Amino acid sequence: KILGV
Amino acid sequence: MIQRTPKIQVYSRHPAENGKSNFLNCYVSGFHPSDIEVDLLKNGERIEKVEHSDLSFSKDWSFYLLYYTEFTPTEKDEYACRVNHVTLSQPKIVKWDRDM
Amino acid sequence: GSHSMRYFFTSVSRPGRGEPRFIAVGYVDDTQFVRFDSDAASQRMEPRAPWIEQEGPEYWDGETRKVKAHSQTHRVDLGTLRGYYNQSEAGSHTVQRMYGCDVGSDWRFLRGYHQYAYDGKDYIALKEDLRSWTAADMAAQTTKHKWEAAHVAEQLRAYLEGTCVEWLRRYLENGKETLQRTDAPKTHMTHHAVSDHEATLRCWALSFYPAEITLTWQRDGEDQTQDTELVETRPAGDGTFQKWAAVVVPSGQEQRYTCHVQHEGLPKPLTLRWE
């Protein structure tokens, strides 16, 4: 599961 | 701006045997930026049902891609891979060599 | 052994051709199971491995939802990073982002990472401690200070040490038949005359997994590192890898040479030789 400039 | 020349490899998924089904691969890796034009060729001609993998990259941030297509090798048919990219002055072509 | 999960994000500005292209890919070790192309029809996170396909709506909804957010973050960035480098709004540019986590044999957290590149070069990246940053230059320092202020690293540490390893562990189960396999290289040598006093003895390793492999040639035990042509390990297309290594041998000396293969999936290394 992926991360939830 | 950084720019890297693609490396190219032409090869089949399985050992090439005449009269049997296989996949013709063109591996390009690395290159930068990602804008790249790749074609597979059967007897100097562009192949229509060619698929590629999803754009990914390596430790050094250079990109790589697999282009591939079903085909059955014969004794006469020639295959190659044509690649174009900003780092190349003219599209580079690489013939398939089964042997090797 | 150990395992890893990594996600790869590529954002490419297209001035005069609508919004930037955004592609994302997910890997566990040397296998992919996720993917997303802003240009595709679905506008969904899609499956690229059989063992992830029946995760459920929640998973697919969750991932899709977040990946769209990632895409938007990168859209903004491409514009910000133009100004940073006083770049003309005509040029097409690239942002790359990679992060993921590792576990060891015991499947416990081992290390996390998160880096970022503008136009093919290190821009900014998280240090091994997961608490601080390392900027590549003047522009990137500004970004450093921004994220330092917003306590951004602390949240990456939380994801990396939690959700990241958690799902890596879950996928290793889901696809235990794929991800917990060791396809030993199938090997052989070819011989081809170049001239009338030179031959081509290239070794082959086929259908192996994972990618990590070592092919070396030797003459009388002596390594021919400098005299070996080695190709990049390449995808077979079926989830396995290939590699070969060739040397030139003055015809008559073939028996001087041996090829050596080392891979996780071999009991012991192989010592081929065109005897």
Side-chain angles (χ1 to χ4, degrees):
Chain A
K1 288 200 162 173
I2 65 188
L3 181 77
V5 305
Chain B
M1 208 195 294
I2 277 173
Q3 283 187 345
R4 302 185 183 287
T5 313
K7 290 173 269 298
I8 312 171
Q9 292 199 69
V10 191
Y11 58 98
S12 53
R13 190 178 291 182
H14 308 273
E17 323 177 52
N18 290 339
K20 300 172 169 172
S21 59
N22 209 317
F23 278 87
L24 177 66
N25 285 330
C26 192
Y27 189 51
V28 295
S29 59
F31 64 94
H32 222 291
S34 46
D35 299 317
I36 195 152
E37 300 127 68
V38 174
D39 324 285
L40 296 174
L41 318 178
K42 172 175 174 197
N43 300 128
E45 197 142 36
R46 186 183 170 281
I47 299 183
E48 287 198 317
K49 57 170 178 182
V50 179
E51 301 203 302
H52 58 87
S53 47
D54 303 310
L55 185 63
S56 182
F57 53 78
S58 316
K59 207 194 210 307
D60 60 352
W61 309 97
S62 55
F63 296 112
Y64 60 88
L65 279 166
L66 184 62
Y67 286 80
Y68 58 84
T69 182
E70 311 172 321
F71 82 129
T72 294
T74 69
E75 191 188 331
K76 288 205 276 278
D77 286 323
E78 290 175 21
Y79 296 90
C81 181
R82 190 182 57 233
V83 176
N84 207 12
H85 183 270
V86 65
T87 59
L88 292 166
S89 65
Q90 63 151 47
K92 186 183 172 61
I93 300 183
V94 183
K95 308 198 159 308
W96 176 47
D97 193 339
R98 38 161 101 212
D99 68 336
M100 301 199 168
Chain C
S2 82
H3 304 275
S4 76
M5 178 159 72
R6 294 151 182 174
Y7 286 103
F8 296 84
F9 302 97
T10 300
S11 195
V12 188
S13 77
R14 296 180 290 200
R17 288 193 303 290
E19 310 298 332
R21 209 207 175 111
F22 180 81
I23 289 163
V25 300
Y27 285 85
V28 166
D29 304 323
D30 292 317
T31 311
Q32 172 190 20
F33 57 112
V34 147
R35 90 137 172 188
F36 175 82
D37 174 5
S38 69
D39 290 343
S42 64
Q43 294 308 292
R44 298 296 299 278
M45 186 77 101
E46 307 175 326
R48 307 289 290 175
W51 53 262
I52 197 79
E53 285 182 5
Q54 291 304 304
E55 215 61 13
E58 198 281 323
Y59 179 88
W60 290 115
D61 278 17
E63 295 310 286
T64 298
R65 202 201 62 249
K66 295 176 284 165
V67 83
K68 287 179 175 185
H70 279 38
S71 172
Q72 214 59 216
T73 299
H74 281 241
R75 183 199 167 288
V76 175
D77 291 348
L78 281 152
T80 304
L81 292 162
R82 178 173 53 102
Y84 277 14
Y85 296 101
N86 188 8
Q87 271 153 12
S88 70
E89 66 174 339
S92 165
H93 284 83
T94 309
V95 163
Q96 280 162 94
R97 191 187 180 196
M98 188 277 300
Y99 61 70
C101 47
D102 298 347
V103 294
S105 279
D106 56 9
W107 281 25
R108 293 182 183 174
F109 179 86
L110 195 38
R111 69 181 75 100
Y113 34 87
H114 178 285
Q115 33 232 228
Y116 202 96
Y118 191 52
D119 290 340
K121 179 62 173 171
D122 279 336
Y123 181 72
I124 197 185
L126 196 60
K127 315 182 78 182
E128 288 188 319
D129 75 325
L130 308 180
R131 317 175 320 182
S132 50
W133 305 95
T134 306
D137 67 15
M138 198 53 80
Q141 294 293 330
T142 302
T143 298
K144 186 183 205 272
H145 295 126
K146 279 187 176 47
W147 295 352
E148 285 172 347
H151 288 268
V152 174
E154 275 74 70
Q155 295 153 48
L156 296 176
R157 178 162 70 258
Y159 164 81
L160 287 171
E161 303 189 321
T163 300
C164 195
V165 280
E166 165 193 0
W167 284 90
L168 169 53
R169 284 196 284 259
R170 178 167 285 199
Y171 301 137
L172 286 158
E173 291 151 2
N174 283 1
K176 71 179 174 185
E177 289 128 337
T178 293
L179 300 174
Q180 310 197 36
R181 91 204 154 143
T182 24
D183 294 1
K186 307 194 305 188
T187 51
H188 67 283
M189 289 181 43
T190 54
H191 186 286
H192 300 298
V194 171
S195 41
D196 62 319
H197 66 97
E198 285 207 311
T200 299
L201 293 171
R202 131 197 324 110
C203 199
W204 284 92
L206 291 172
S207 205
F208 61 95
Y209 181 93
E212 172 72 319
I213 192 165
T214 295
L215 297 182
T216 69
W217 270 107
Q218 302 174 15
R219 193 179 53 188
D220 290 333
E222 305 283 31
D223 289 345
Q224 300 280 110
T225 59
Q226 278 196 114
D227 304 293
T228 309
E229 178 182 27
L230 204 63
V231 292
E232 285 201 348
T233 299
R234 64 195 195 195
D238 63 356
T240 79
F241 298 84
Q242 314 179 349
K243 193 180 189 80
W244 63 252
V247 289
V248 176
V249 176
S251 299
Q253 287 183 225
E254 287 80 16
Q255 286 204 121
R256 293 187 81 194
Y257 292 84
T258 61
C259 169
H260 304 271
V261 192
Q262 339 194 229
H263 194 258
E264 223 170 272
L266 286 170
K268 291 200 156 197
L270 303 173
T271 291
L272 300 61
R273 350 162 14 108
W274 192 267
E275 43 214 334

